[PDB]
Amino acid sequence: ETQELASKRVDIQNKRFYLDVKQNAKGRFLKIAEVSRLTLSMSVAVEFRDYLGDFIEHYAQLGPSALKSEFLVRENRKYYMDLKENQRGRFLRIRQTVNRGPGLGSTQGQTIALPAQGLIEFRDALAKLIDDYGV
Amino acid sequence: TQELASKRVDIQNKRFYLDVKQNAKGRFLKIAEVGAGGNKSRLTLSMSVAVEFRDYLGDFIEHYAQLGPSALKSEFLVRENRKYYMDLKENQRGRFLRIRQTVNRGPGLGSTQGQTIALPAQGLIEFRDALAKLIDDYGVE
Amino acid sequence: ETQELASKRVDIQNKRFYLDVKQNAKGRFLKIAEVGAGGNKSRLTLSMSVAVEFRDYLGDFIEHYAQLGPSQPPRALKSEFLVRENRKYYMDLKENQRGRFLRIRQTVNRGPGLGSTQGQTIALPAQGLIEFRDALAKLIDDYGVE
Amino acid sequence: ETQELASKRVDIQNKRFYLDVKQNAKGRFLKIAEVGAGGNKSRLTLSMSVAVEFRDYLGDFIEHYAQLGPSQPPDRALKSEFLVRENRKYYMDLKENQRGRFLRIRQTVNRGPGLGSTQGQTIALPAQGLIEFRDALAKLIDDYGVE
């Protein structure tokens, strides 16, 4: 039975993300729901934490007006991370795909969009779930 | 006293206006937090002073980005008759930069009262950027 | 009056540097600007004569950077100091968690740093030091004297 | 099958390079994927033994690049090296085009016809990143190599 060990809430402009660390008898993993839904192993969650730091850095150094991308393939899942910008402002979009195993053949590629203002809070929340629970 | 330009910045559920203006003696910025505070929550900076302020924000941004999960930082700025107190704090609702501006009453006596804005830390990069643009525009070379 | 003689853009990671050669009645000189977030407080000034000595210092930082090997307040790896023509140039190779960089701070030189310094600072990501030295060397071959 | 032990991304100009340490039933090895600005991906595969030699060779390219001085006008590779270890060859050429110098590494089969585009198993490191790349490689070798 998958039982959540912790929830986390991050408010950014008028959007909300929940970071739930869950564990079924397979192991421990992270879920990230918007106001779609990513699922990450803790090991992959570490890579995100660090990549978020890369993104934060780049955003702080932009100054006034993709800007930056990362490409991650881990355990049958592929993650695209694009720091972009548009009329209303800068954001980080994260798309999760199945590129192998059960679930291939799609209708369900997952996506979340974080406003850039909240990357630091979102990274800080992730970091502490890693901190507490480890890999 | 000309209006030269405005820029608006929404941070979380709070709104700020950076307004450039000129009068003889020079150009200057007015930064207001929208609320019930009126002029109590509105700063006034010369252009010279805006630059030093922009740079201080650079430093607050760096401190905030490396806090990790958790006054955290204080800086200080005085020019002509005006003092600017900058304090990166955290209360239960999150991290913020409090800028309190004072007008010196005379040789070695602080104001009984000042004006103050509070920026949620998640908005500092936006704020800094809006301010940087207006500085690049409205008085160099 | 100031003639604009030449201009060179050097892109290094997510930074852009401009090297402008100018000339006034006193002689030829460089202005070196870093673009972005910071202001025109990221503006170095150097006669051609001093730009030569700066090029040579950059060769030593390049050697040191190449010999660091993999990494591990901020750690000061190599510091050098150039004072010339009533200006002081501090050159510190440093590293943080996010990479290695050469920070150059220019001040106006009176006594043992007495008055207003006029702290102009640029920060070259270390990756770019050879590109930067090279652009500078070209401008010196083209516009310097002997 | 293959387990993923460690990753490191090096940003050089508008490209990215992923150095991945992996292990299969036979061996531990390194995959190096270049991602171009436009989406182009290409890669090398190195045994950990070979990465040591590649890292050493990078040191030679670094020394050469640092000593070049700026591109002079025309009047071809500025420097070539060659690496052969059993079933894989690697052609290392330091070149320049209008946008800079770069180290092309081109991996081929040693015995076998070959398969796939030559570009898909070639990478081009902008020379500016040789030091950071060699350093990131040196670290992965330190922390997951036995050699």
Numbering used by the authors:
A (entry chain C): 57 to 91, 98 to 127, 142 to 211
B (entry chain D): 58 to 127, 142 to 212
C (entry chain A): 57 to 128, 139 to 212
D (entry chain B): 57 to 131, 141 to 212
The authors write:
Mutations in the human PURA gene cause the neurodevelopmental PURA syndrome. Based on the crystal structures of PURA from Drosophila melanogaster (dmPURA), three conserved sequence regions termed PUR repeats I, II, and III were identified to fold into globular domains. Whereas PUR repeat I and II assemble into an N-terminal PUR domain via intramolecular interactions, two C-terminal PUR repeats III from different molecules interact with each other and thus mediate dimerization of PURA. All these PUR domains belong to the class of the PC4-like protein family, which mainly bind single-stranded nucleic acids and can unwind double-stranded DNA and RNA.
CD spectra had already suggested that this mutation has no dramatic effect on the overall domain folding. To assess if this variant has a rather local effect on the structural integrity of PURA that may not be detectable by CD spectroscopy, we solved the crystal structure of hsPURA I–II R140P at 2.15 Å resolution. The crystals of R140P variant protein exhibited the same space group, unit cell parameters, and crystal packing as the wild-type protein. The R140P variant is located at the end of the flexible linker between PUR repeats I and II connecting helix α1 to the strand β5. Because of its position in a flexible region, the mutated residue is partially visible only in one out of four PURA chains in the asymmetric unit. The overlap of the R140P-variant structure with the PURA I–II WT fragment confirmed our previous observation about the unusually high flexibility of the strands β4 and β8 forming the β-ridge. Since no major structural differences were visible between hsPURA I–II WT and R140P variant (average r.m.s.d. of 0.89 Å for 133 Cα atoms aligned), we concluded that this genetic variation is unlikely to impair the structural integrity of hsPURA. In contrast, hsPURA I–II R140P did not show impaired RNA binding. In contrast, hsPURA I–II R140P variant showed wild-type-like separation of dsDNA, further supporting our previous interpretation from RNA-binding analyses that the genetic variant R140P is likely functional.
